[PDB]
């Protein structure tokens, strides 16, 4: 597997909120991943080549192939490991399981959970119009949604510390409900029971765009 990254987190955070890459373009280089939509209109979650748009009101909907993204990370998911949990386990305990199995922080990880979540707390960015406010101020204003006792799917990546300028260092995880109508970017969660599948990734492709805003960003 190759982690295929569209653009750079530094470019996104600098104010480059639009790109020309479509959701269909993303699915050329993976069936699994995360990212942001143009104008920061929420975030995407993708697994088994199904893509959904998660928005600031807690909603999820099917992503359309023509929608565009300024930043995303995709892969052809090829997990090496599977662990079933029959009793409650916290996000941080699950990360401890992954980190024991893949202890080098110098590798990436892709992870998926299918199961029943005791709770899943989410906060997702709303669509932005320029001039842009500081991202931290936008996040201060966004409600946290709390999904309680819901079946659903989690998609995530673990990014090395040696990558903080380029991508989201540490764990980045998104959630969607079984009915595919709710979800968001995860702040914390606890799994009541479910199946974790995950694997390490050694290869990263960074595709730098050609739009003028990216080229002129500092």
> Where along the sequence are the contacts to Zn ion (CB under 5 A)?
43, 185
DSSP string covering 20-89, please? Answer: SEEHHHHHTS-SEEEEE-GGG--EEEEETTEEEEE-TTSBEEEPPTT-EESEEEEE-----EEEEESS-E
Q: Closest by alpha carbon to 187, among 132, 138, 125?
A: 125
2 lies in the site for its own copies, by CB under 8 A = yes
Instruction: Give the single-character DSSP code of 177.
Output: E
CB half-sphere exposure, 49, CA atoms < 13 A? 7
What residue 124 binds from Na ion, Zn ion, Cl ion, none (CB within 5 to 8 A, per partner kind)? Na ion
What residue 43 binds from Zn ion, Cl ion, its own copies, none (CB within 5 to 8 A, per partner kind)? Zn ion
Contact stretch for its own copies (CB under 8 A) within 20-28, 77-85, 180-188, 200-208 = 200-208
The dihedral built from the CA positions of residue 193, 199, 200 and 201, taken in this order, carries a sign that is negative
Site string for its own copies, 160-189 (x = CB under 8 A): --xx-xx-----------------------
Restricted to residues 87-116, the positions that interact with its own copies (CB under 8 A) are: 104, 106-107
Smallest distance from Cl ion to CB 191, Å: 10
Among 3, 173, 191, 201, binds Cl ion (CB under 5 A): 173
206 lies in the site for its own copies, by CB under 8 A = yes
55 lies in the site for Na ion, by CB under 5 A = no
Cα separation, 27 vs 100, whole angstroms? 31
Smallest distance from Zn ion to CB 184, Å: 8
95 lies in the site for Cl ion, by CB under 5 A = no
CA torsion angle for 156, 48, 118, 54 (degrees, to 10)? 70
28 lies in the site for its own copies, by CB under 8 A = no
121 lies in the site for Na ion, by CB under 5 A = no
Cβ atoms of residues 146 and 207 within 8 Å: no
Q: Which is nearer to Cl ion, 119 or 172 (CB)?
A: 172
- The terminus-to-terminus CA distance of the chain in angstroms comes to 31
DSSP bridge partners of 195? 84, 114
Residues interacting with its own copies, by CB under 8 A?
2, 8, 10-11, 104, 106-107, 162-163, 165-166, 202-210, 214-217
Residues interacting with Cl ion, by CB under 5 A?
116, 172-173, 186
């Amino acid at each position: 597997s190759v982690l295929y990254q569209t653009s750079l987190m530094s470019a996104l955070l600098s104010g480059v909120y639009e790109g020309s890459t479509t959701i269909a373009d993303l699915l050329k280089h993976g069936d699994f991943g995360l990212g942001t939509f143009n104008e920061l209109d929420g975030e995407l979650i993708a697994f088994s080549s199904q893509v959904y748009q998660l928005r600031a009101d807690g909603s999820a909907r099917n992503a359309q192939p023509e929608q565009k993204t300024p930043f995303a990370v995709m892969t052809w998911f090829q997990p090496q490991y599977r662990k079933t949990f029959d009793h409650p386990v916290s996000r941080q305990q699950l990360h401890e399981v992954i980190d024991q199995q893949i202890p080098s922080d110098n590798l990436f990880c892709a992870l998926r959970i299918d199961g029943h979540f005791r709770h899943a707390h989410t906060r997702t960015v709303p669509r932005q119009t320029p001039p842009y406010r500081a991202m931290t101020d936008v996040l201060d204003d966004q409600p946290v949604f709390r999904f309680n006792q819901r079946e659903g799917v989690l998609v995530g990546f673990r990014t090395p510390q040696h990558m903080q300028g380029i991508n989201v260092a540490g764990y980045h995880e998104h959630f969607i409900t079984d009915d595919r109508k709710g979800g968001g970017h995860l702040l914390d969660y606890q799994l009541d029971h479910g199946v974790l599948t995950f694997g390490e990734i050694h290869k990263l492709m960074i595709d730098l765009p050609a739009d003028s805003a990216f080229l002129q960003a500092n």
